[PDB]
Amino acid sequence: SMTARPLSELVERGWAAALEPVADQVAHMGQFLRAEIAAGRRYLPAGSNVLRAFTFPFDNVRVLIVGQDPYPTPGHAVGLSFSVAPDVRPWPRSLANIFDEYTADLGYPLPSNGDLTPWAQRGVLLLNRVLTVRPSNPASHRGKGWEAVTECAIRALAARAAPLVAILWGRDASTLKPMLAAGNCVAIESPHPSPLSASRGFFGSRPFSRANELLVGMGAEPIDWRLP
Ligand SMILES: O=c1[nH]cc([N+](=O)[O-])c(=O)[nH]1
Numbered sequence: 001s002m003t004a005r006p007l008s009e010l011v012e013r014g015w016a017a018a019l020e021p022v023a024d025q026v027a028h029m030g031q032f033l034r035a036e037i038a039a040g041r042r043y044l045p046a047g048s049n050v051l052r053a054f055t056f057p058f059d060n061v062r063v064l065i066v067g068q069d070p071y072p073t074p075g076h077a078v079g080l081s082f083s084v085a086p087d088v089r090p091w092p093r094s095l096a097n098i099f100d101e102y103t104a105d106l107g108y109p110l111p112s113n114g115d116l117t118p119w120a121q122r123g124v125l126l127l128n129r130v131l132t133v134r135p136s137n138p139a140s141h142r143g144k145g146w147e148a149v150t151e152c153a154i155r156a157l158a159a160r161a162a163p164l165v166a167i168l169w170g171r172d173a174s175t176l177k178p179m180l181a182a183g184n185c186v187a188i189e190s191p192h193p194s195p196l197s198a199s200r201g202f203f204g205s206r207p208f209s210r211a212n213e214l215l216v217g218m219g220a221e222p223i224d225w226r227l228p
Pocket residue numbers: 067068069070071072080081082083094128194
């Protein structure tokens with residue numbers, strides 16, 4: 001529980017130190033979620049998954065992907081942005097669009113399922129600007145306190161010696177751009193893959209190959225984006 005336990009016991013070592021400036025704010029978010037349940041509203045993803053992106057090592061992040069907020073359908077969000085459990089189908093629309101672009105950019109076949117854990121395990125941080133949502137209500141937790149947490153995460157990543165490429169999908173993600181100004185960091189921005197915006201510049205944006213070109217240009221290894 002984020003209200004009950006400290007960062008050292010919720011997230012990976014590097015992340016617990018990175019997020020020290022927002023320790024109280026994370027506990028406050030736990031209190032917010034408690035108050036939602038007390039008031040008769042629910043949230044997604046499950047409590048134990050909310051901070052899941054911060055359970056993969058901070059020092060190993062090469063690429064940061066940032067979306068808006070978690071999937072609004074019960075049974076979709078898993079605490080890694082855009083990912084779904086391997087048994088979920090049909091895929092949510094944003095994910096189908098991401099995979100459409102993945103195939104066009106990289107030439108790989110469509111993935112077998114919507115599980116993006118391989119990316120997380122290879123140094124891609126799958127974040128959202130806001131880490132919870134009320135079921136069936138996109139953006140419902142905007143402005144409730146998560147933004148300070150994800151701002152802190154991004155500043156910390158940018159302050160590392162380690163190279164970073166950021167991919168910012170949509171307007172809320174784009175508000176992280178000022179914090180990404182560091183010599184060791186470069187940001188790709190596009191419209192969000194949702195059907196509401198994808199035709200404004202998500203399709204054709206080739207984020208995966210661009211990220212790899214940027215990594216290689218700062219002397220880092222490219223991501224193996226290939227999903228099974
Ligand atoms: O984890 C995510 N799932 C869904 C979306 N989206 O639909 O806006 C998003 O931005 N991030």
